Amino acid sequence: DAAPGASKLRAVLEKLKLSRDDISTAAGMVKGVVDHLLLRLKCDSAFRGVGLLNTGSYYEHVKISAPNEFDVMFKLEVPRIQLEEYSNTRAYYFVKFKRNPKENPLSQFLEGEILSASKMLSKFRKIIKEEINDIKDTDVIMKRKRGGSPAVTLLISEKISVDITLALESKSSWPASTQEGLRIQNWLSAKVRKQLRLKPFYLVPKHAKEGNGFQEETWRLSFSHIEKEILNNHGKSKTCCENKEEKCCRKDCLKLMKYLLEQLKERFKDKKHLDKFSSYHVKTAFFHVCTQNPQDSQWDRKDLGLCFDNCVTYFLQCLRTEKLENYFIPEFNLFSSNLIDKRSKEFLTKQIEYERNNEFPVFDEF
Amino acid sequence: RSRKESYSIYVYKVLKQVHPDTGISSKAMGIMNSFVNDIFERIAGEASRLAHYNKRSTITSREIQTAVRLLLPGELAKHAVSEGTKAVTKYTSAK
Amino acid sequence: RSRKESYSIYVYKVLKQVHPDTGISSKAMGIMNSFVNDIFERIAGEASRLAHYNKRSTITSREIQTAVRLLLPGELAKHAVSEGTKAVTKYTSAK
Amino acid sequence: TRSSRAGLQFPVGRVHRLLRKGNYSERVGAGAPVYLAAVLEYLTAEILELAGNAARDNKKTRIIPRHLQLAIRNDEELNKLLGRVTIAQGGVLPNIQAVLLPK
Numbered sequence: 031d032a033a034p035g036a037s038k039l040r041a042v043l044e045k046l047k048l049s050r051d052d053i054s055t056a057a058g059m060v061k062g063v064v065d066h067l068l069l070r071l072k073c074d075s076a077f078r079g080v081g082l083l084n085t086g087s088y089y090e091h092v093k094i095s096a097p098n099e100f101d102v103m104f105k106l107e108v109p110r111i112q113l114e115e116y117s118n119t120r121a122y123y124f125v126k127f128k129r130n131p132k133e134n135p136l137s138q139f140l141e142g143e144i145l146s147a148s149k150m151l152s153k154f155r156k157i158i159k160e161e162i163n164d165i166k167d168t169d170v171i172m173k174r175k176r177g178g179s180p181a182v183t184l185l186i187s188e189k190i191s192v193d194i195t196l197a198l199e200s201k202s203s204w205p206a207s208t209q210e211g212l213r214i215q216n217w218l219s220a221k222v223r224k225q226l227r228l229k230p231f232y233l234v235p236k237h238a239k240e241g242n243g244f245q246e247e248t249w250r251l252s253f254s255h256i257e258k259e260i261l262n263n264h265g266k267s268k269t270c271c272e273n274k275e276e277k278c279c280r281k282d283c284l285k286l287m288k289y290l291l292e293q294l295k296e297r298f299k300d301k302k303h304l305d306k307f308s309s310y311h312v313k314t315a316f317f318h319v320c321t322q323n324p325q326d327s328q329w330d331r332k333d334l335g336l337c338f339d340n341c342v343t344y345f346l347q348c349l350r351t352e353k354l355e356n357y358f359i360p361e362f363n364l365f366s367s368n369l370i371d372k373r374s375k376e377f378l379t380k381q382i383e384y385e386r387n388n389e390f391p392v393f394d395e396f
Numbered sequence: 397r398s399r400k401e402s403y404s405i406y407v408y409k410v411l412k413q414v415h416p417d418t419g420i421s422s423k424a425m426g427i428m429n430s431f432v433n434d435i436f437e438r439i440a441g442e443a444s445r446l447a448h449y450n451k452r453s454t455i456t457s458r459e460i461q462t463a464v465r466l467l468l469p470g471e472l473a474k475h476a477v478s479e480g481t482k483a484v485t486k487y488t489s490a491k
Numbered sequence: 492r493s494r495k496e497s498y499s500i501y502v503y504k505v506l507k508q509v510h511p512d513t514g515i516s517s518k519a520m521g522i523m524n525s526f527v528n529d530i531f532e533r534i535a536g537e538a539s540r541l542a543h544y545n546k547r548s549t550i551t552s553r554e555i556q557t558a559v560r561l562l563l564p565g566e567l568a569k570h571a572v573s574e575g576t577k578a579v580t581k582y583t584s585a586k
Numbered sequence: 587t588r589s590s591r592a593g594l595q596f597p598v599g600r601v602h603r604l605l606r607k608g609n610y611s612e613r614v615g616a617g618a619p620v621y622l623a624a625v626l627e628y629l630t631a632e633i634l635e636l637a638g639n640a641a642r643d644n645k646k647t648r649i650i651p652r653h654l655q656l657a658i659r660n661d662e663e664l665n666k667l668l669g670r671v672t673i674a675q676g677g678v679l680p681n682i683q684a685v686l687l688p689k
């Protein structure tokens with residue numbers, strides 16, 4: 031049916047998807063809580079323009095192995111923001127409102143000429159807390175602050191967790207620095223690249239932690255909706271994955287890589303040797319692999335056993351070279367020494383190499 | 397083979413600054429061109445009227461600043477004055 | 492053959508930083524030594540008094556900073572606070 | 587140059603030649619063309635930026651006069667600046683009086 035080595039990965043995928051056949055309840059409760067939250071937020075002057083980013087999608091599972099953890103992003107229209115690049119990092123920016131006649135309700139959140147991530151986050155969390163206290167017959171608990179990117183984490187009953195991330199939306203041109211990225215010209219099209227550039231970009235509150243200090247009011251770029259689009263429309267042929275003749279395995283490769291990372295993080299969660307890694311590194315690495323392998327025949331499902339392996343090698347190569355460019359920002363090094371120490375990188379390299387040399391036993395252990 | 401002046405390439409450069417992928421069609425080019433001409437003639441005319449009103453013979457940055465504060469409406473006025481002060485100040489910063 | 496502690500070689504290294512050719516005589520060595528001891532005992536004593544005054548059980552960099560702002564006079568205080576913040580921040584920058 | 591000295595894109599040299607050969611005054615302070623070129627470049631950046639966005643809404647990568655009219659008339663303080671200016675091939679603001687709508 032397929033090249034040798036497939037059946038094990040296919041069984042892993044089947045178990046993982048079997049873990050997704052009882053979500054309707056969880057997803058429904060998430061829809062309810064998010065809808066309540068949006069109803070309240072739209073009433074505050076500051077948040078009249080909050081909306082669901084992935085329209086008609088009240089979920090996005092970032093952990094393929096955690097079906098009861100959801101990820102949602104609340105977009106905020108916020109027009110005409112002049113961005114000022116923070117200390118040449120290409121990914122973290124200060125936001126300054128440009129001239130606008132109709133008063134913008136985000137004035138209250140200014141700190142001088144800069145829109146303060148802190149104050150916005152504070153108001154956001156206060157509104158969420160007071161609204162979820164209006165949930166009389168369901169214990170929805172707001173988790174304590176940890177950072178700025180996972181703005182709010184809610185716990186429903188004793189099984190559901192939902193991460194709500196607030197994002198500013200800009201309809202304006204993509205920031206000057208972030209141009210040479212999204213190199214899908216030879217994979218999807220140059221015209222699709224142009225069209226995607228026409229789509230808005232987003233800003234998530236994320237402190238840029240420099241060695242000397244972290245600047246509390248800085249924002250990071252977000253193209254996760256673009257990432258979703260390329261993930262769900264991923265082939266050169268427009269009919270990819272819609273028929274038996276054009277069935278690819280790209281999505282399966284991504285899922286298997288994420289499952290590998292999540293299991294390896296779970297086994298070593300208590301030793302803090304993998305804390306710094308996330309699914310985003312593997313998703314960007316996969317997108318690099320799709321860039322290096324643009325043709326759908328290089329992703330034939332029957333070659334799953336091989337294709338995953340090549341992706342693994344690319345990830346391992348990044349781990350050895352301390353270089354993984356953000357797919358939209360070629361000058362943003364996710365794998366630089368300043369964000370992750372060498373020791374954790376060699377640790378992850380060795381563990382994945384062991385797993386690959388032993389037919390991935392960690393997939394079955396827990 | 398003469399040299400007719402117009403602000404084509406200048407407006408074009410400001411465009412490439414503010415929208416590195418958006419072009420501009422020759423008719424909208426002409427419109428931006430006549431807009432630059434109109435606003436510049438307004439501002440210089442008001443600067444001239446200021447100068448003659450106070451019996452001066454120089455249009456300095458003071459007169460251009462008061463012209464901008466007279467023509468452009470409120471917020472546009474404040475931001476344009478800031479932009480001009482910054483440019484002039486930077487010009488003084490060089491030699 | 493015991494090990495008596497003292498800040499001899501440390502003061503010596505700071506000297507070689509700030510005057511790579513100037514030595515320091517054993518008696519001035521003893522004076523710098525007792526100066527380090529005196530200032531460190533003052534600062535830690537004031538940090539302890541701060542902690543107990545606010546019913547805390549940890550001398551953190553907050554207490555040392557307020558101790559420095561209380562003991563050292565004005566300009567010396569500001570520059571010492573800057574130096575300590577920079578050192579602590581750099582320490583956080585590593586792992 | 588002299589426009590680069592000021593971090594401008596509009597030509598301070600040309601604006602000087604126009605303030606001088608335009609008979610606005612006998613003398614022109616050497617700091618005036620800079621200020622004026624900056625104000626012109628700021629207003630042009632404002633217009634072109636609002637214009638660009640509208641074009642992007644019409645999912646188009648090329649400003650045309652309609653987009654300039656949409657930008658100039660939607661913005662409140664650009665409207666007041668060009669209140670008495672008709673833009674060729676500009677059309678109007680989509681606006682049906684609420685009394686005329688069906689009931």
Ligand SMILES: [Zn+2]
Pocket residue numbers: 264265270271272276277278279
């Ligand atoms: Zn496909």
